[PDB]
Amino acid sequence: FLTAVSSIDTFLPVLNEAKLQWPTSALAASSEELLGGYVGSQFYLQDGKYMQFQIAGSSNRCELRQMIPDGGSEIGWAVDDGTTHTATSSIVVPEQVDGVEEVTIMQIHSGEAPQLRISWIRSKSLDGVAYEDFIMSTVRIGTGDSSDNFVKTHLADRTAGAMSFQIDVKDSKLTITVNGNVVVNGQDLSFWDGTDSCYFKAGAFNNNPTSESATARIKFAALAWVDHH
Ligand SMILES: O=C(O)[C@H]1O[C@@H](O[C@H]2[C@H](O)[C@H](O)[C@@H](O)O[C@@H]2C(=O)O)[C@@H](O)[C@@H](O)[C@@H]1O
Ligand SMILES: O=C(O)[C@H]1O[C@@H](O[C@H]2[C@H](O)[C@H](O)[C@H](O)O[C@@H]2C(=O)O)[C@@H](O)[C@@H](O)[C@@H]1O
């Protein structure tokens, strides 16, 4: 078998507060299964050090979903509880194979919608400007489909090396730091005031591929979800 992610210490804290969804939103592995050696080509320890996710197919995923720690059920939190909810990662986004067009690698999501997606995207125009092979944030400020429901930002061009991300939510404000630099500084999340079902996700969620067989692949050198109070 492939080497399991849980065979080293690095990812145990997040696996202790996650379930894996693969190849859809259906459950693939409970937290205890993840901590106890769950493995496959979709989710394995790569190069002795990366938690790697792989998935093909439109809207398919191999994704961790935040759970109450220590064998608890699904978590839900609010954007304005006075604490800071923080997700910190170090991600190697390799060159994506032909047919893969957008891969969501971290989220804040609730019962209804994604508050935030951080995604790799092959090419896109944002605010009249073309970008290629880059990392984007998409924040929902509404539940509709017109462009005014979203705030989209160029976070960074994709690098060969690991790229760090920190997502901080405090007092209905979102901050995204990339390689130690604040990129998104206090984006308003007030539309979500009253929602108590938010949670973090991370992995690979394949969006709008041009081929159903093309496999998205994303490597995490680090991932942690914490609440600072
Ligand atoms: O046409 C789009 O690509 C549309 O998608 C929106 O993101 C959605 C994702 O693609 C996934 O379907 C899932 O995560 O739901 C997302 C959503 O409904 O917010 C946005 O990227 C939007 O800007 C875009 O028009
Ligand atoms: O598939 C979706 O549209 C969303 O489902 C969410 O996962 C749910 C889902 O109901 C599962 O069947 C399971 O029973 O509970 C999941 C949960 O963790 O809340 C999310 O995967 C979400 O990202 C999807 O957009």
Side-chain angles (χ1 to χ4, degrees):
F1 301 80
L2 294 160
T3 304
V5 172
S6 61
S7 68
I8 63 171
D9 60 358
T10 301
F11 305 98
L12 302 185
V14 73
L15 299 179
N16 183 54
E17 52 174 343
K19 65 178 175 175
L20 186 75
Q21 298 173 314
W22 168 84
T24 65
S25 283
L27 177 69
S30 71
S31 177
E32 289 211 2
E33 289 179 282
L34 291 170
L35 289 167
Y38 179 89
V39 64
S41 59
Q42 70 278 16
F43 181 78
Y44 71 93
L45 192 72
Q46 202 276 350
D47 293 354
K49 69 187 186 186
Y50 302 101
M51 175 171 63
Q52 182 180 266
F53 302 84
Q54 284 195 110
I55 187 65
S58 290
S59 302
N60 281 344
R61 69 192 74 223
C62 190
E63 200 178 27
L64 296 172
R65 189 287 200 214
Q66 190 186 0
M67 302 292 279
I68 292 169
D70 311 318
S73 57
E74 284 77 12
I75 203 167
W77 45 261
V79 302
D80 57 4
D81 62 20
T83 75
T84 303
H85 292 270
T86 300
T88 306
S89 67
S90 181
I91 307 180
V92 174
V93 183
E95 287 184 19
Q96 298 296 304
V97 305
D98 288 354
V100 181
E101 305 308 322
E102 177 173 13
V103 184
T104 294
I105 65 185
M106 302 175 80
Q107 308 197 56
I108 302 164
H109 206 287
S110 67
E112 184 182 3
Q115 290 66 47
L116 169 65
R117 300 184 303 102
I118 296 183
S119 62
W120 169 83
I121 188 162
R122 188 172 296 274
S123 73
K124 183 138 183 100
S125 179
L126 296 178
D127 200 11
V129 179
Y131 300 92
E132 302 274 355
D133 191 27
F134 74 103
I135 315 299
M136 183 169 69
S137 59
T138 300
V139 173
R140 274 186 170 276
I141 59 171
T143 52
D145 293 331
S146 45
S147 51
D148 66 314
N149 290 277
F150 309 92
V151 182
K152 292 166 98 71
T153 307
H154 174 270
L155 294 180
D157 289 345
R158 187 186 62 75
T159 58
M163 179 169 282
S164 68
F165 300 86
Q166 191 176 316
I167 301 170
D168 295 306
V169 177
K170 179 184 170 186
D171 291 351
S172 309
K173 305 213 151 52
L174 168 67
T175 298
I176 306 176
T177 304
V178 181
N179 288 336
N181 305 144
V182 171
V183 181
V184 170
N185 195 346
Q187 163 69 55
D188 195 4
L189 296 180
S190 289
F191 175 77
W192 300 104
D193 288 3
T195 296
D196 193 41
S197 63
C198 295
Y199 53 91
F200 289 126
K201 313 193 86 191
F205 166 39
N206 191 33
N207 314 121
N208 311 318
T210 66
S211 155
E212 293 304 301
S213 62
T215 301
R217 185 170 64 83
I218 304 293
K219 304 205 300 192
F220 284 71
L223 178 66
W225 289 332
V226 307
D227 194 38
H228 299 287
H229 45 265

mmCIF file with all atom_site columns, all heavy atoms in Angstrom, residues 26-45:
data_model
loop_
_atom_site.group_PDB
_atom_site.id
_atom_site.type_symbol
_atom_site.label_atom_id
_atom_site.label_alt_id
_atom_site.label_comp_id
_atom_site.label_asym_id
_atom_site.label_entity_id
_atom_site.label_seq_id
_atom_site.pdbx_PDB_ins_code
_atom_site.Cartn_x
_atom_site.Cartn_y
_atom_site.Cartn_z
_atom_site.occupancy
_atom_site.B_iso_or_equiv
_atom_site.pdbx_formal_charge
_atom_site.auth_seq_id
_atom_site.auth_comp_id
_atom_site.auth_asym_id
_atom_site.auth_atom_id
_atom_site.pdbx_PDB_model_num
ATOM 1   N N   . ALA A 1 26 ? -19.781 12.913 -0.024 1.00 0.00 ? 26 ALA A N   1
ATOM 2   C CA  . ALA A 1 26 ? -20.004 11.762 0.836  1.00 0.00 ? 26 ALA A CA  1
ATOM 3   C C   . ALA A 1 26 ? -18.751 11.451 1.647  1.00 0.00 ? 26 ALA A C   1
ATOM 4   O O   . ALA A 1 26 ? -17.619 11.687 1.220  1.00 0.00 ? 26 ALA A O   1
ATOM 5   C CB  . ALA A 1 26 ? -20.404 10.542 0.012  1.00 0.00 ? 26 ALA A CB  1
ATOM 6   N N   . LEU A 1 27 ? -18.968 10.903 2.833  1.00 0.00 ? 27 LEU A N   1
ATOM 7   C CA  . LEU A 1 27 ? -17.871 10.573 3.721  1.00 0.00 ? 27 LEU A CA  1
ATOM 8   C C   . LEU A 1 27 ? -17.000 9.481  3.112  1.00 0.00 ? 27 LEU A C   1
ATOM 9   O O   . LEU A 1 27 ? -17.502 8.450  2.645  1.00 0.00 ? 27 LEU A O   1
ATOM 10  C CB  . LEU A 1 27 ? -18.457 10.097 5.048  1.00 0.00 ? 27 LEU A CB  1
ATOM 11  C CG  . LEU A 1 27 ? -17.455 9.639  6.111  1.00 0.00 ? 27 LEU A CG  1
ATOM 12  C CD1 . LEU A 1 27 ? -16.663 10.819 6.620  1.00 0.00 ? 27 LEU A CD1 1
ATOM 13  C CD2 . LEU A 1 27 ? -18.182 8.925  7.235  1.00 0.00 ? 27 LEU A CD2 1
ATOM 14  N N   . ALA A 1 28 ? -15.692 9.704  3.124  1.00 0.00 ? 28 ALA A N   1
ATOM 15  C CA  . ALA A 1 28 ? -14.714 8.679  2.789  1.00 0.00 ? 28 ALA A CA  1
ATOM 16  C C   . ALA A 1 28 ? -14.022 8.099  4.012  1.00 0.00 ? 28 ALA A C   1
ATOM 17  O O   . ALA A 1 28 ? -13.775 6.890  4.066  1.00 0.00 ? 28 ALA A O   1
ATOM 18  C CB  . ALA A 1 28 ? -13.653 9.231  1.837  1.00 0.00 ? 28 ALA A CB  1
ATOM 19  N N   . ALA A 1 29 ? -13.696 8.930  4.995  1.00 0.00 ? 29 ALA A N   1
ATOM 20  C CA  . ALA A 1 29 ? -12.983 8.474  6.176  1.00 0.00 ? 29 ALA A CA  1
ATOM 21  C C   . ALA A 1 29 ? -13.312 9.378  7.352  1.00 0.00 ? 29 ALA A C   1
ATOM 22  O O   . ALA A 1 29 ? -13.221 10.604 7.248  1.00 0.00 ? 29 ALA A O   1
ATOM 23  C CB  . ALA A 1 29 ? -11.471 8.473  5.943  1.00 0.00 ? 29 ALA A CB  1
ATOM 24  N N   . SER A 1 30 ? -13.679 8.767  8.473  1.00 0.00 ? 30 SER A N   1
ATOM 25  C CA  . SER A 1 30 ? -13.830 9.496  9.715  1.00 0.00 ? 30 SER A CA  1
ATOM 26  C C   . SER A 1 30 ? -12.468 9.981  10.210 1.00 0.00 ? 30 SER A C   1
ATOM 27  O O   . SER A 1 30 ? -11.410 9.494  9.804  1.00 0.00 ? 30 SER A O   1
ATOM 28  C CB  . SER A 1 30 ? -14.432 8.583  10.778 1.00 0.00 ? 30 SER A CB  1
ATOM 29  O OG  . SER A 1 30 ? -13.458 7.623  11.163 1.00 0.00 ? 30 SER A OG  1
ATOM 30  N N   . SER A 1 31 ? -12.508 10.911 11.164 1.00 0.00 ? 31 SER A N   1
ATOM 31  C CA  . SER A 1 31 ? -11.294 11.370 11.824 1.00 0.00 ? 31 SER A CA  1
ATOM 32  C C   . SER A 1 31 ? -10.465 10.206 12.339 1.00 0.00 ? 31 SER A C   1
ATOM 33  O O   . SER A 1 31 ? -9.249  10.164 12.146 1.00 0.00 ? 31 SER A O   1
ATOM 34  C CB  . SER A 1 31 ? -11.682 12.300 12.962 1.00 0.00 ? 31 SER A CB  1
ATOM 35  O OG  . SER A 1 31 ? -10.549 12.722 13.688 1.00 0.00 ? 31 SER A OG  1
ATOM 36  N N   . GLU A 1 32 ? -11.105 9.239  12.998 1.00 0.00 ? 32 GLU A N   1
ATOM 37  C CA  . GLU A 1 32 ? -10.338 8.126  13.554 1.00 0.00 ? 32 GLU A CA  1
ATOM 38  C C   . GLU A 1 32 ? -9.753  7.248  12.457 1.00 0.00 ? 32 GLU A C   1
ATOM 39  O O   . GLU A 1 32 ? -8.647  6.721  12.605 1.00 0.00 ? 32 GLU A O   1
ATOM 40  C CB  . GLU A 1 32 ? -11.167 7.294  14.539 1.00 0.00 ? 32 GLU A CB  1
ATOM 41  C CG  . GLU A 1 32 ? -11.445 8.028  15.843 1.00 0.00 ? 32 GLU A CG  1
ATOM 42  C CD  . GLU A 1 32 ? -11.561 7.112  17.070 1.00 0.00 ? 32 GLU A CD  1
ATOM 43  O OE1 . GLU A 1 32 ? -11.389 5.865  16.963 1.00 0.00 ? 32 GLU A OE1 1
ATOM 44  O OE2 . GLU A 1 32 ? -11.821 7.656  18.170 1.00 0.00 ? 32 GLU A OE2 1
ATOM 45  N N   . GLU A 1 33 ? -10.470 7.070  11.350 1.00 0.00 ? 33 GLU A N   1
ATOM 46  C CA  . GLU A 1 33 ? -9.887  6.344  10.224 1.00 0.00 ? 33 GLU A CA  1
ATOM 47  C C   . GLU A 1 33 ? -8.670  7.074  9.672  1.00 0.00 ? 33 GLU A C   1
ATOM 48  O O   . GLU A 1 33 ? -7.650  6.447  9.364  1.00 0.00 ? 33 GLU A O   1
ATOM 49  C CB  . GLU A 1 33 ? -10.913 6.136  9.114  1.00 0.00 ? 33 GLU A CB  1
ATOM 50  C CG  . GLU A 1 33 ? -11.990 5.141  9.425  1.00 0.00 ? 33 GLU A CG  1
ATOM 51  C CD  . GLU A 1 33 ? -12.983 5.021  8.284  1.00 0.00 ? 33 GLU A CD  1
ATOM 52  O OE1 . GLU A 1 33 ? -13.860 5.908  8.135  1.00 0.00 ? 33 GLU A OE1 1
ATOM 53  O OE2 . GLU A 1 33 ? -12.878 4.046  7.513  1.00 0.00 ? 33 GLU A OE2 1
ATOM 54  N N   . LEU A 1 34 ? -8.753  8.409  9.565  1.00 0.00 ? 34 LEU A N   1
ATOM 55  C CA  . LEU A 1 34 ? -7.623  9.194  9.079  1.00 0.00 ? 34 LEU A CA  1
ATOM 56  C C   . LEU A 1 34 ? -6.426  9.062  10.011 1.00 0.00 ? 34 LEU A C   1
ATOM 57  O O   . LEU A 1 34 ? -5.290  8.900  9.563  1.00 0.00 ? 34 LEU A O   1
ATOM 58  C CB  . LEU A 1 34 ? -8.030  10.667 8.949  1.00 0.00 ? 34 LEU A CB  1
ATOM 59  C CG  . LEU A 1 34 ? -9.036  10.963 7.844  1.00 0.00 ? 34 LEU A CG  1
ATOM 60  C CD1 . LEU A 1 34 ? -9.556  12.392 7.977  1.00 0.00 ? 34 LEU A CD1 1
ATOM 61  C CD2 . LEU A 1 34 ? -8.397  10.753 6.496  1.00 0.00 ? 34 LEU A CD2 1
ATOM 62  N N   . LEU A 1 35 ? -6.659  9.168  11.319 1.00 0.00 ? 35 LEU A N   1
ATOM 63  C CA  . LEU A 1 35 ? -5.589  9.042  12.297 1.00 0.00 ? 35 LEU A CA  1
ATOM 64  C C   . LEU A 1 35 ? -5.053  7.626  12.350 1.00 0.00 ? 35 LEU A C   1
ATOM 65  O O   . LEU A 1 35 ? -3.950  7.409  12.863 1.00 0.00 ? 35 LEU A O   1
ATOM 66  C CB  . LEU A 1 35 ? -6.121  9.404  13.680 1.00 0.00 ? 35 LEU A CB  1
ATOM 67  C CG  . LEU A 1 35 ? -6.434  10.879 13.915 1.00 0.00 ? 35 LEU A CG  1
ATOM 68  C CD1 . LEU A 1 35 ? -7.241  11.002 15.208 1.00 0.00 ? 35 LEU A CD1 1
ATOM 69  C CD2 . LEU A 1 35 ? -5.161  11.690 13.995 1.00 0.00 ? 35 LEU A CD2 1
ATOM 70  N N   . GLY A 1 36 ? -5.828  6.660  11.871 1.00 0.00 ? 36 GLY A N   1
ATOM 71  C CA  . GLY A 1 36 ? -5.496  5.257  11.944 1.00 0.00 ? 36 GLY A CA  1
ATOM 72  C C   . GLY A 1 36 ? -5.114  4.649  10.616 1.00 0.00 ? 36 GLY A C   1
ATOM 73  O O   . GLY A 1 36 ? -5.331  3.458  10.417 1.00 0.00 ? 36 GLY A O   1
ATOM 74  N N   . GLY A 1 37 ? -4.551  5.430  9.705  1.00 0.00 ? 37 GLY A N   1
ATOM 75  C CA  . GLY A 1 37 ? -3.901  4.877  8.538  1.00 0.00 ? 37 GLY A CA  1
ATOM 76  C C   . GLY A 1 37 ? -4.696  4.835  7.249  1.00 0.00 ? 37 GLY A C   1
ATOM 77  O O   . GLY A 1 37 ? -4.227  4.232  6.278  1.00 0.00 ? 37 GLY A O   1
ATOM 78  N N   . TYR A 1 38 ? -5.856  5.483  7.180  1.00 0.00 ? 38 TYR A N   1
ATOM 79  C CA  . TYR A 1 38 ? -6.580  5.522  5.913  1.00 0.00 ? 38 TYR A CA  1
ATOM 80  C C   . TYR A 1 38 ? -5.672  6.047  4.815  1.00 0.00 ? 38 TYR A C   1
ATOM 81  O O   . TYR A 1 38 ? -5.004  7.068  4.992  1.00 0.00 ? 38 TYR A O   1
ATOM 82  C CB  . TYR A 1 38 ? -7.799  6.436  6.040  1.00 0.00 ? 38 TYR A CB  1
ATOM 83  C CG  . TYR A 1 38 ? -8.604  6.562  4.772  1.00 0.00 ? 38 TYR A CG  1
ATOM 84  C CD1 . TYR A 1 38 ? -9.632  5.678  4.488  1.00 0.00 ? 38 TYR A CD1 1
ATOM 85  C CD2 . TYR A 1 38 ? -8.346  7.573  3.861  1.00 0.00 ? 38 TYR A CD2 1
ATOM 86  C CE1 . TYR A 1 38 ? -10.380 5.804  3.326  1.00 0.00 ? 38 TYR A CE1 1
ATOM 87  C CE2 . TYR A 1 38 ? -9.078  7.697  2.707  1.00 0.00 ? 38 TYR A CE2 1
ATOM 88  C CZ  . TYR A 1 38 ? -10.099 6.823  2.443  1.00 0.00 ? 38 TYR A CZ  1
ATOM 89  O OH  . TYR A 1 38 ? -10.826 6.965  1.279  1.00 0.00 ? 38 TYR A OH  1
ATOM 90  N N   . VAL A 1 39 ? -5.690  5.378  3.660  1.00 0.00 ? 39 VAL A N   1
ATOM 91  C CA  . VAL A 1 39 ? -4.785  5.719  2.570  1.00 0.00 ? 39 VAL A CA  1
ATOM 92  C C   . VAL A 1 39 ? -5.354  5.231  1.248  1.00 0.00 ? 39 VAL A C   1
ATOM 93  O O   . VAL A 1 39 ? -6.038  4.205  1.184  1.00 0.00 ? 39 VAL A O   1
ATOM 94  C CB  . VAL A 1 39 ? -3.369  5.148  2.839  1.00 0.00 ? 39 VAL A CB  1
ATOM 95  C CG1 . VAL A 1 39 ? -3.399  3.622  2.859  1.00 0.00 ? 39 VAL A CG1 1
ATOM 96  C CG2 . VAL A 1 39 ? -2.364  5.653  1.833  1.00 0.00 ? 39 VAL A CG2 1
ATOM 97  N N   . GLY A 1 40 ? -5.028  5.952  0.184  1.00 0.00 ? 40 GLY A N   1
ATOM 98  C CA  . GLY A 1 40 ? -5.238  5.500  -1.180 1.00 0.00 ? 40 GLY A CA  1
ATOM 99  C C   . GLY A 1 40 ? -4.554  6.472  -2.118 1.00 0.00 ? 40 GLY A C   1
ATOM 100 O O   . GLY A 1 40 ? -3.968  7.468  -1.694 1.00 0.00 ? 40 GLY A O   1
ATOM 101 N N   . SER A 1 41 ? -4.658  6.214  -3.419 1.00 0.00 ? 41 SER A N   1
ATOM 102 C CA  . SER A 1 41 ? -4.041  7.121  -4.381 1.00 0.00 ? 41 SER A CA  1
ATOM 103 C C   . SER A 1 41 ? -4.583  8.537  -4.245 1.00 0.00 ? 41 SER A C   1
ATOM 104 O O   . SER A 1 41 ? -3.888  9.498  -4.594 1.00 0.00 ? 41 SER A O   1
ATOM 105 C CB  . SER A 1 41 ? -4.267  6.617  -5.798 1.00 0.00 ? 41 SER A CB  1
ATOM 106 O OG  . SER A 1 41 ? -5.647  6.510  -6.067 1.00 0.00 ? 41 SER A OG  1
ATOM 107 N N   . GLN A 1 42 ? -5.821  8.679  -3.768 1.00 0.00 ? 42 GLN A N   1
ATOM 108 C CA  . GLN A 1 42 ? -6.449  9.983  -3.589 1.00 0.00 ? 42 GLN A CA  1
ATOM 109 C C   . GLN A 1 42 ? -5.906  10.760 -2.395 1.00 0.00 ? 42 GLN A C   1
ATOM 110 O O   . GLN A 1 42 ? -6.123  11.978 -2.324 1.00 0.00 ? 42 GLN A O   1
ATOM 111 C CB  . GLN A 1 42 ? -7.960  9.816  -3.408 1.00 0.00 ? 42 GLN A CB  1
ATOM 112 C CG  . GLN A 1 42 ? -8.446  9.190  -2.095 1.00 0.00 ? 42 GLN A CG  1
ATOM 113 C CD  . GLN A 1 42 ? -8.407  7.669  -2.051 1.00 0.00 ? 42 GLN A CD  1
ATOM 114 O OE1 . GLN A 1 42 ? -7.756  7.016  -2.868 1.00 0.00 ? 42 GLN A OE1 1
ATOM 115 N NE2 . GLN A 1 42 ? -9.090  7.094  -1.055 1.00 0.00 ? 42 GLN A NE2 1
ATOM 116 N N   . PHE A 1 43 ? -5.245  10.091 -1.445 1.00 0.00 ? 43 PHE A N   1
ATOM 117 C CA  . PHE A 1 43 ? -4.903  10.688 -0.151 1.00 0.00 ? 43 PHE A CA  1
ATOM 118 C C   . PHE A 1 43 ? -3.768  9.855  0.448  1.00 0.00 ? 43 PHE A C   1
ATOM 119 O O   . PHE A 1 43 ? -4.024  8.808  1.047  1.00 0.00 ? 43 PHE A O   1
ATOM 120 C CB  . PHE A 1 43 ? -6.118  10.695 0.765  1.00 0.00 ? 43 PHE A CB  1
ATOM 121 C CG  . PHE A 1 43 ? -5.864  11.326 2.110  1.00 0.00 ? 43 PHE A CG  1
ATOM 122 C CD1 . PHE A 1 43 ? -5.833  12.713 2.241  1.00 0.00 ? 43 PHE A CD1 1
ATOM 123 C CD2 . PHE A 1 43 ? -5.651  10.547 3.246  1.00 0.00 ? 43 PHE A CD2 1
ATOM 124 C CE1 . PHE A 1 43 ? -5.598  13.300 3.467  1.00 0.00 ? 43 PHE A CE1 1
ATOM 125 C CE2 . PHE A 1 43 ? -5.400  11.134 4.473  1.00 0.00 ? 43 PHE A CE2 1
ATOM 126 C CZ  . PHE A 1 43 ? -5.374  12.510 4.590  1.00 0.00 ? 43 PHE A CZ  1
ATOM 127 N N   . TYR A 1 44 ? -2.532  10.319 0.284  1.00 0.00 ? 44 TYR A N   1
ATOM 128 C CA  . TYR A 1 44 ? -1.391  9.556  0.764  1.00 0.00 ? 44 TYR A CA  1
ATOM 129 C C   . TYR A 1 44 ? -0.248  10.506 1.077  1.00 0.00 ? 44 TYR A C   1
ATOM 130 O O   . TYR A 1 44 ? -0.253  11.684 0.701  1.00 0.00 ? 44 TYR A O   1
ATOM 131 C CB  . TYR A 1 44 ? -0.976  8.430  -0.217 1.00 0.00 ? 44 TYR A CB  1
ATOM 132 C CG  . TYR A 1 44 ? -0.333  8.894  -1.513 1.00 0.00 ? 44 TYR A CG  1
ATOM 133 C CD1 . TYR A 1 44 ? 1.034   9.006  -1.616 1.00 0.00 ? 44 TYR A CD1 1
ATOM 134 C CD2 . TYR A 1 44 ? -1.094  9.174  -2.645 1.00 0.00 ? 44 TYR A CD2 1
ATOM 135 C CE1 . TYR A 1 44 ? 1.638   9.429  -2.794 1.00 0.00 ? 44 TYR A CE1 1
ATOM 136 C CE2 . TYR A 1 44 ? -0.495  9.586  -3.831 1.00 0.00 ? 44 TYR A CE2 1
ATOM 137 C CZ  . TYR A 1 44 ? 0.867   9.701  -3.895 1.00 0.00 ? 44 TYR A CZ  1
ATOM 138 O OH  . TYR A 1 44 ? 1.420   10.148 -5.063 1.00 0.00 ? 44 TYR A OH  1
ATOM 139 N N   . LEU A 1 45 ? 0.737   9.962  1.795  1.00 0.00 ? 45 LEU A N   1
ATOM 140 C CA  . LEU A 1 45 ? 1.932   10.700 2.175  1.00 0.00 ? 45 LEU A CA  1
ATOM 141 C C   . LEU A 1 45 ? 2.929   10.640 1.033  1.00 0.00 ? 45 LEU A C   1
ATOM 142 O O   . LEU A 1 45 ? 3.371   9.561  0.629  1.00 0.00 ? 45 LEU A O   1
ATOM 143 C CB  . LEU A 1 45 ? 2.554   10.118 3.443  1.00 0.00 ? 45 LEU A CB  1
ATOM 144 C CG  . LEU A 1 45 ? 3.635   11.009 4.054  1.00 0.00 ? 45 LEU A CG  1
ATOM 145 C CD1 . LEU A 1 45 ? 3.051   12.268 4.703  1.00 0.00 ? 45 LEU A CD1 1
ATOM 146 C CD2 . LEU A 1 45 ? 4.465   10.240 5.073  1.00 0.00 ? 45 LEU A CD2 1
#
